[PDB]
Design a protein around this ligand. Structure first.
Ligand SMILES: CC(=O)N[C@H]1[C@H]([C@H](O)[C@H](O)CO)O[C@](OP(=O)(O)OC[C@H]2O[C@@H](n3ccc(N)nc3=O)[C@H](O)[C@@H]2O)(C(=O)O)C[C@@H]1O
Length: 268
């Protein structure tokens, strides 16, 4: 089992994980090649602070969940990668406030530069670095070289806020996942879902998380918008979220809903 309490784990996350974006003052994003590309205003001036927020997993158990009104009844909603609301609004809601994407999508998915779903809300892209790398070292060897398509999207959509997560943040979170499950952890970075939860805990007083912990609807379907199975179709991440959950067991089983307090509200 996990050795620390929920209250202590929340404080450890607040203190060890630096939720911040690459800034125009971080070398080499202050080079002439990068001038004008990054947002100059912090995400904290575009995003909140908010009272009640939703994080919507991309899990297949959202299909037929009819969670759309529950999700939309929030100040802000975060979604992941290419997860759509169109044709699914009754299950997953209509609002998209923040969309967190991995660098694989930005680098290799041609629809990133074509599909209008990406044009709504605030965008964040993240890329897994080598563990313990700083920004200059990471820049020389990203997991996916997403920088060109980032720049292209910025030019096509200059007034949509589009941030890059600092590379240190996923591994800081990994450190805490290892503390709580050292014998089971894999040397892969946390999932986008886990990152998005921590991001919303930084911007919100209360974070409701839908179908990250499995509900009655647990299914073989990997993602709610999947049309069939292919090569496209975590345990310690779920245990962390369960450990921090303030909601009822009934909310998990029926609504697939966990509720986590935001960092602004905890006492350390
Ligand atoms: C084939 C593949 O690469 N799948 C990965 C996809 C894929 O790269 C993107 O959709 C871009 O195409 O990205 C991930 O997955 P993705 O961002 O799509 O999914 C969002 C988050 O929902 C949670 N989830 C999803 C499915 C499921 N059955 N259970 C879940 O709990 C996870 O927390 C997940 O992160 C990712 O970024 O994390 C991780 C996935 O492994």
């Amino acid at each position: 089992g996990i050795k620390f309490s929920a209250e202590a784990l929340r404080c450890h996350l607040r203190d060890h994980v630096n939720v911040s974006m690459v800034e125009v003052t971080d070398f080499p994003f202050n080079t002439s090649e990068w001038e004008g590309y990054l947002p100059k205003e912090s995400i904290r001036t575009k995003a909140g602070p908010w009272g009640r927020c939703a994080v919507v997993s991309s899990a297949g158990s959202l299909k037929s969940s009819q969670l759309g009104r529950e999700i939309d009844d929030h100040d802000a909603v975060l979604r992941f990668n290419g997860a759509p609301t169109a044709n699914f609004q009754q299950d997953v809601g209509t609002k998209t406030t923040i969309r967190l994407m991995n660098s694989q999508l930005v680098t290799t998915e041609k629809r990133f530069l074509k599909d209008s779903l990406y044009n709504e809300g605030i965008l964040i892209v993240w890329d897994p670095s080598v563990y313990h790398s700083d920004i200059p070292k990471w820049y020389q060897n990203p997991d996916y070289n997403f920088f060109n398509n980032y720049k292209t999207y910025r030019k096509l959509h200059p007034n949509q806020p589009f941030y890059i997560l600092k590379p240190q943040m996923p591994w800081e979170l990994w450190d805490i996942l290892q503390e709580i499950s050292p014998e089971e952890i894999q040397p892969n970075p946390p999932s986008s879902g886990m990152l998005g939860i921590i991001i919303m805990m930084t911007l919100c007083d209360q974070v409701d998380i839908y179908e990250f912990l499995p509900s009655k609807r647990k299914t073989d379907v990997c993602y709610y918008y999947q049309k069939f199975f292919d090569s496209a179709c975590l345990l310690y991440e779920k245990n962390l979220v369960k450990h921090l959950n303030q909601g009822t067991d009934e909310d998990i089983y029926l609504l697939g809903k966990a509720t986590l307090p935001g960092f602004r509200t905890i006492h350390c």
